Design an enzyme around this catalytic site. Structure first.
Site, short mmCIF file in Angstrom:
data_model
loop_
_atom_site.label_atom_id
_atom_site.label_comp_id
_atom_site.label_asym_id
_atom_site.label_seq_id
_atom_site.Cartn_x
_atom_site.Cartn_y
_atom_site.Cartn_z
CG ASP A 97 -60.77 1.48 -44.94
OD1 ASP A 97 -60.60 0.88 -46.03
OD2 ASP A 97 -60.13 1.23 -43.89
CG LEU A 130 -57.86 13.25 -50.25
CD1 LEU A 130 -57.89 13.81 -51.64
CD2 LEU A 130 -59.23 12.70 -49.81
CD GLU A 131 -58.88 5.89 -49.13
OE1 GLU A 131 -58.67 4.69 -48.80
OE2 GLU A 131 -59.98 6.49 -48.91
CD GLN A 132 -52.27 4.02 -54.62
OE1 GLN A 132 -51.27 4.18 -55.34
NE2 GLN A 132 -52.54 2.87 -54.03
#
Ligand code: NA
Length: 446
Positions: A97, A130-132
């Site tokens: 998020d 970083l997220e996906q």
């Protein structure tokens, strides 16, 4: 504060900039002051630099959560404390998020913000976590590298080593993989990678003899750690080469901290390190999500009495000073096909870097030849030396026979180009069984 670079083996710990974090089995991660973090985690990573609201633009930033019960003056001094103790505090860019969607051009803004936040809290570098969604998002794969590259130079001028780390989930590390841009672009700039070997349950690798090892498998955890490691530290089994001196093993601290990938027995990890050590490639340390969960409590309000660090910390520290893998790097080498009697330049496409980032493409030699004239499969070996080390790497060239090759029965027409005994003869009219070269000065073939 000044930039404190970690230079021995590392245990790495994410620090929550939130309170009462709920776990996958209904535990709690209370917030904790930096200076409560077990002193054996000599790399703490503040989590997370993101975009808090869109009305501040695309550039992410960091702000201490009011709830944490810390003055930003205190926070800043707690970092100065760790720094002084020789430990290192990092800002982790991303998380969930994080709404990190940078477009091209944002480099300078990101860089400047990084540099501001750094000069203010006395952070020692950044962790790309970083997220996906955010790995590929817009221009991230350009902007982020671009930024940090600039940042690193800013500090290089003063004489300081801005620490760069990343935290890709392992599947993304397969060469030709989302994170390739980052790793490729940041080579020589990054201090060390701390992949997440968690939360990709079913994923993993196939080892010849052993079969399909997955991160969700606790019977073969020793294997997983050993094999994925060996692959990464050697660039084998379809995995990018992270040097061993720059690889750190990212783990849940416990079961609350992740869906899957918590090691039940440490021995597994111990053996694997001794394995990788035995082969001449000891790892750089471990990493966990998180000190908070380790300092936390489970769904029965039972303390995880900071286990992981007990598990892993003497383990890692009692290891030996890292030794730098000053081997150079050879990218471009991809097995290629070439048309009969066609032209081939070996040194086209090939680039070579040293250990520190510098391009040595010039110093690349080649051993072998590829006789396009004869069909077959020919084997080049590329080689580059720097900092008293050599990297050698084979390359296969298959020669295809092509349509154009003259066949007896083939009816060719005017202006047709065929090939025979090493030449590209043109027809001047209809033909059907006149071997190019048996004609004459004014023959069917020319
Ligand atoms: Na600092």
């Amino acid at each position: 504060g000044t930039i404190t670079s970690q230079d021995d083996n590392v245990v790495v710990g994410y620090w929550h900039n939130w309170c009462d974090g709920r776990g996958y089995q209904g535990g709690n991660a209370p917030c904790v002051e930096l200076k409560t973090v077990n002193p054996q985690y000599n790399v703490v990573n503040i989590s997370f630099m993101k975009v808090y609201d869109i009305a501040e633009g695309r550039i992410p930033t960091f702000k201490l959560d009011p709830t944490i019960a810390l003055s930003e003056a205190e926070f800043i001094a707690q970092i100065d404390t760790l720094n002084s103790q020789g430990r290192s505090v990092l800002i982790a860019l991303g998380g969930a998020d994080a709404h990190i969607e940078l477009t091209r051009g944002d480099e300078d803004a990101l860089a400047a913000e990084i540099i501001r936040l750094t000069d203010l809290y006395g952070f020692d570098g950044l962790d790309i976590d970083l997220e996906q969604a955010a790995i590929t998002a817009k221009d991230n794969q350009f902007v982020i590298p671009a930024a940090l590259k600039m940042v690193k130079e800013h500090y290089r001028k003063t004489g300081d080593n801005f620490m760069i780390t990343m935290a890709p989930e392992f599947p993304y590390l397969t060469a030709n993989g989302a994170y390739t841009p980052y790793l490729t672009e940041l080579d020589g700039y990054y201090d060390f990678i701390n992949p997440q070997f968690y939360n990709q349950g079913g994923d993993g690798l196939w080892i010849e003899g052993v079969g399909w090892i997955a991160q969700n498998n606790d019977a073969l955890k020793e294997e997983f750690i050993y094999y994925i490691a060996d692959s990464l530290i050697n660039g084998t089994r379809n995995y990018h080469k992270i040097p061993h001196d720059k690889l750190v093993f990212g783990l849940p601290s416990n079961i609350d901290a992740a869906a899957t990938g918590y090691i039940q027995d440490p021995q597994d990890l111990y053996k694997a390190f001794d394995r990788l050590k035995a082969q001449g490639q000891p790892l750089r340390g471990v990493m966990t999500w998180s000190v908070n969960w380790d300092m936390g409590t489970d769904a029965a309000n039972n303390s995880y009495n900071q286990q992981f660090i007990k598990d892993y910390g003497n383990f890692i520290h009692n290891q030996l000073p890292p030794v730098t893998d000053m081997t150079p790097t050879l990218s471009g080498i991809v097995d290629t096909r070439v048309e009969l009697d066609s032209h081939f330049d070996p040194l086209i496409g090939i680039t070579a870097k040293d250990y520190q980032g510098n391009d040595i493409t010039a110093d690349v030699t080649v051993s072998g030849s590829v006789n396009t004239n004869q069909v077959g499969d020919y084997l080049l070996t590329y080689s580059v030396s720097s900092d008293d080390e050599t990297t050698n790497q084979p390359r296969k060239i298959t020669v295809y026979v092509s349509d154009d090759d003259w066949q007896v029965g083939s009816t060719y027409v005017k202006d047709d180009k065929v090939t025979h005994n090493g030449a590209t003869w043109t027809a001047q009219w209809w033909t059907k069984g006149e071997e190019p070269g048996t004609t004459g000065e004014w023959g069917v073939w020319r």
